Amino acid sequence: AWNRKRISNCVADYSVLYNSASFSTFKCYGVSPTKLNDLCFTNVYADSF
């Protein structure tokens, strides 16, 4: 029953999540982690489980 939080209409700083060492694994496909701070998106979904 994985949850889905929708996040939109905000300024989202991804640098904190990229730089924080608390994450065991931060791997992603399609777009590079280091340029996320410059792109703009329509909406983002966080599927956490």
Binding site: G30, V31, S32, T34, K35, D38, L39
Partner: protein, 49 residues
């Protein structure tokens, strides 16, 4: 005489509309793939275009 004009116009139009084709790239505009992929992963996409 009108046919030569028509054929040249059609060839140019298909040449121009071939810039809309992906050819397997994640996107057809080179600027956005360049602006959202790091070089080592953007070279493989640009090669297809």
């Amino acid at each position: 005489l009108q046919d030569v004009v028509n054929q040249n116009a059609q060839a140019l139009n298909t040449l121009v509309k071939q810039l809309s084709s992906n050819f397997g790239a994640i996107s057809s505009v080179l600027n956005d793939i360049l602006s959202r992929l790091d070089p080592p992963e953007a070279e493989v996409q640009i090669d297809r275009l």
